[model samples]
Target chain A: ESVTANIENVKKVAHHIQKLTSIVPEIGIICGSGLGKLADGVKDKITIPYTKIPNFPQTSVVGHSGNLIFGTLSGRKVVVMQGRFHMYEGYSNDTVALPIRVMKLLGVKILMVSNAAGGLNRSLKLGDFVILKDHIYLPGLGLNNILVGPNQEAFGTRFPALSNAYDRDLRKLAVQVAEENGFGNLVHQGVYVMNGGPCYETPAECTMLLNMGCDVVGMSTIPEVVIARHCGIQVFAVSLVTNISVLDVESAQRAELMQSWFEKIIEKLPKD
Target chain B: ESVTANIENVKKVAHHIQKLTSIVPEIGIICGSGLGKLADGVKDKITIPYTKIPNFPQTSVVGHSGNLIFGTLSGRKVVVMQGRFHMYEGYSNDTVALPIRVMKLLGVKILMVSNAAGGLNRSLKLGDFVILKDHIYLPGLGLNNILVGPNQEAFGTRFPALSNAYDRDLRKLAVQVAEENGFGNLVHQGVYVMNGGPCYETPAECTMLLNMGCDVVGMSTIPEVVIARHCGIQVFAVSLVTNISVLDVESDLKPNHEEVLATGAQRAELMQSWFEKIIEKLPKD
Candidate 1:
């Protein structure tokens, strides 16, 4: 309750983080639990523990010790989130928005994120990558938007249109890269829907989401994407399918391929 | 929340209300803003202001004039809520569930609720009484289920199958009442979706809801319905179509709260009679 996502409060957290890391990252990667190995490949990284950073959420879960890792990835200045916040874990809107605002404050221009999902699409195979082409924010539709309450004009507009939320060019480039890397079969583009979940979707829910045109469902990412988009940071996100998966969810093999694919994207990414 | 919706906590609130009124009601009615006149029909009514009640959410829409009225309606004991809590007002799950749980503790068996909603289905007309056949909890789908927290084992199961949430017999009975009164043309049954809003549904949101098979969209009813079902209280609820959803934001026409209330005032008497007729037909227990 003490923390607010307002411009001045966000400035405090960003300033504290700035002292601990020298990298003014242009690309922010939310590697989440599904892709920590991606951060392992970051060149000359500086890590800032979540506990030492003021106003950051410290969610109590095993194997989720959090940090902000700063470095270069494929020669592009980047920051990696070792762990991310979730709505189902009892985090407030402010708690979720704070980090995104901090990323905005730290000069991040693009946000790249990965999330684990239950593949509602029957066509999806194991470890297939579904680059987010669009999204349905169930929580937002239901009034739990992380952007609820008062607006912070310093950050962005009040009602941001999500048309092309997942940058069309980035999505197209990601697909072409996967084809070049011989993992074209593993790539698909579709809609991702967020269920504010600590619990998995019920059988009825799965059928409902499928009918809603949602190909994959997950707990995180969408709010972060909304926050990033609101702050004028372009977003590129992927959901690694681990089934009708409904999986070997924490799949190490899928993680490595995703890591390799991301490196390739960054290599071709413009320095502007 | 200073008060939780736990059985022990809710029972205390019920016990407090028992001291203020002698009517041990068999039926509980949530007559939201759209149906306040239903409370006016409660013969020999005894009203208890929300201020007198412990642990109630005091929503500040002044015209609502919140209270619980206990009286006889069509020769049966009943309790009617003049105002209801809405999630859009920032009320917590415990706050919304507390009243229904209090009703359960007060000997209420069946819960009847009425709300105003925007029609999403193309066939609906203004003032059409849409009986709720089913519902899709958009908030629940997104992890905001009213029953998300600790299971109050005293109420119902942890996983209550919402399979036939709006009772078939009750819906059939409601339809029958409409036919007997020659208002059958005014009644329709369909799925209601919750939008969780203080704002009207956006055009894009309306399009998505209409496509999802929702006949009407609203903000208030679904949470109350879930809480009622959770406590093993059979539910019968209806929506008064205050406005039709305009699917393009750029369109010149817009819907407002005054228009919503104006429609409510026009149809209030008809709704009250429909509810009274349904109550009169309830089998004596």
Candidate 2:
């Protein structure tokens, strides 16, 4: 219920952030649906509820918790969003990405995000975290894009090229981190598609999605990532493949098929 | 609510037509937004509200009036839909193109469709009629294709070839009519994109559309045309350019530029008349 100037909440959050931490965190991480467990890895965590923050909208969608946590993880200073925004909850582009704007205003350099998605790749299994190489926005093609409205000069250009949104260095960093910590084979890299889905895609819809160059499909992350990268915030996204999209209905009933899919996901790998 | 299965609603309507005329309509035409005036030219029309037709979904979108008319236009026996469906209204492809299925089933051999559209091609002007040569489905690019779900074998194959949906002969017929009748000056032929629009596109999104090879943008027609062609019905489509898409700052000035632009679009009337002449000459079985 606070009336602050535009971007003022982000500035105030940044001001409060400077008082709490000696080191200005340069990395921002956003956890996806059912992936907030990753937040436990951050040391010296200072969690701030989004409800307590001025100018941030509330969300009730099952997977996202609107809390912002500033902490150290893996010997590095970072700001992590324990839960991210989703479109189905009826949030706009600016509302969905308020925290990323706050992180950039607070001097965060790179923003990393992860989500749980339905696997479209035949080789993919449930519970897999496929590192995002790039994405084709399903909503964007469906005529909903985030790079809309007045360009904020403080952020970046109207056309912030998405050609490099998923940074290559971060991809190598993830693979190396997974391998050095015995999680090497669990990680995979590919494209993701975002839809306005609280309901799963129908079988025919899934086949059409597969033909359109999507590797993984989900409802979250793509919009936040688009807004982030559009504001010149470097982005690297990952998806936890929660279920197979291109499922063989006959084999879907097999215990071994379901079990093997679960075994291949990268989340089981312990973060050092 | 007449329930006689001896003759269905369409056949009942066709039966009524049989009382007046003998020919089954071989050409199908769908009137676009505010263009239903053209259907009045049909003489001795057999009229049926879309609601009265069996299997035809009801439509309530403004600028579209739902009815079916069968009669003679330019001395040719024709069946026409006074209203059409738009993707923005949230109709499925099957629902949107239901009339085409019924028309094809009704033995309509050639289909013509018209729409009011925003001109995206930089050179286009308001009120101009553009003969669509091809269409870019921005929704289809991100996989919102209309040709999805269980294929009705009664219509065509499971995977219909979109390779040549816009028939060349019909386009040539239009060009010939335009040139011969002095309608050539305002007429244009270009690509169109079918957008699912409730809110208009932003300048940036229009740029993305331009990159995707769109020349004109509209909310209807292409899907119906595509489905028509898939079922072996020859297809032709046209757009009555209502507003040029505001692709950027300059594009936002189209309305102000309208006086000069519309003067330039004087050819649209010529194009419209040309379609009439062309439709007469276009071969019909």
Candidate 3:
């Protein structure tokens, strides 16, 4: 009953949004921790609070004001999700995928997602941006996979190959965008791992993830990316290194250096 | 509704089992893949099929028949789960923990569990027994943890320290038993990693698990162990290296379940003997 109800609900929300805005978004952007500034970039935006939206899951997390904005970004029609649901917050997998499916129905073709993560790779600094090349989904590995239930045939196939989930052209475009903005030195590409966390990882866990070839670790992004990819939405995700995950003296010193640069970016944001 | 119902349901099952048998079991043994032969060792057995038991989830997997056996092993009363629940099979965490909790209420103190695992450590050979020294629970790490929901204060603490979940004395005893029986060469201790597997790990996954310091890999055991430990039950678990996992050149050639089971049968007797000796030596309080 919930599954069937959920399908109808996504359509209900999408139809409601269509009535409210003339802009049909070709791109969907999900803002992450301390990174909801992307929504501010949208011009002539029609803001819909999640509480007012039909069948939308409310966001309770701090730094995430639950709003759905439809506007123009880079002269492209876009929809920006100011907050996204997390599995750790006790949302079901279907509920977590609901917003992504709603974006698909609203004519979103490309999904750009961002999250703050702990730098697992030794070479990574605190404030650097790492573009997702691939991911080792720990939750998915243990049957907590978002794709476990009945496949919504309208959206996609039962077995979606993840080999190309992160589109190559979009990644190159993201790097190019970074270079053009002159912050290219701050951008790097690497593998990201998703952990189920309300609590941070124990030091031993970080070592395990690092050994498994993960360069950064976070609690979100992978599920949204998976659902987006399953529905044939081109995905491009980036992670902002929030802290050094594994302990090392040299990285600690570099982490302290990155701290000053990190605060500068937040300070640069327009005054409330 | 399910949470309250589950707590009441476990007491009901325990009450039913208490009326059915006179045995107050101290040790609870959960048989893992192809290791159900341990049930045959029970004397004066009273068998209860899972279907007849209220609130008990039925087991549907191959090589695992759903039944609860109450009997005696080596002069000590015991309860054995001939088959176990797995998360990959689509059971809820509460359903999985129900039986272990029932055992606790029925006076089970020590959880003795076994599973057939693929050896990730290069030093391991087929049919070797590894006493679980530590574990990396991926399901728990990913928020699919068994203890994710409300804590049952009736059972134990909200955050039980796992530093000594596997009893030190029990592990030492298991090692000593193997040495006394001349199979000490076959017994080793290492870390176990639990994957949510309806499908076995791909080669890339195996490499990742190996790099993470796992010696053996399996789908079951960890959930049961977690539930067991949460309710203050002492745990002593072992993994039988049924196949050399994905990378052992000769074993990787086939990687079939039947072949692993076939090798398991060859090694089952030694494992049974080792457990029998361990139980006989347990200091009855």
TM-score of chain A by itself in each prediction: 0.95, 0.82, 0.87
How is the predicted docking of candidate 3 categorized under the CAPRI scheme?
incorrect
In candidate 1, how many Å is residue B12 off? Answer: 4.7
Against the hidden true structure, what lDDT does model 3 obtain? 0.78
User: lDDT (CA) for every model shown?
Assistant: 0.84, 0.66, 0.78
Question: Which run of 10 residues does model 2 chain B get worst, by summed lDDT?
Answer: B1-10
- CA lDDT, candidate 2, residue B141: 39
All predictions: root-mean-square deviation over Cα? 7.7, 12.9, 7.6
Per-prediction TM-score: 0.62, 0.51, 0.63
Which residue runs of candidate 2 sit more than 4 Å off their true CA positions? A1-272, B1-22, B60-65, B250-272
Candidate DockQ values, in order, are 0.12, 0.04, 0.17
Name the TM-score of candidate 1: 0.62
Point out the higher-scoring one by TM-score: 2 or 3. 3
The TM-score of chain B in candidate 1 is 0.96
Model 3 C-alpha lDDT per residue in residues B118-153, reported as the tens digit of each score = 888989998899988777777778887776655666
Candidate number that wins on lDDT, 1 or 2: 1
lDDT by residue (A75-167, candidate 3, tens digit) is 577888877777766678877888999999999888877788889898999788898999999889777888888888888888989978898
Give RMSD (Å) of candidate 1 vs. truth. Answer: 7.7
Q: Count of backbone clashes for each model?
A: 0, 0, 0
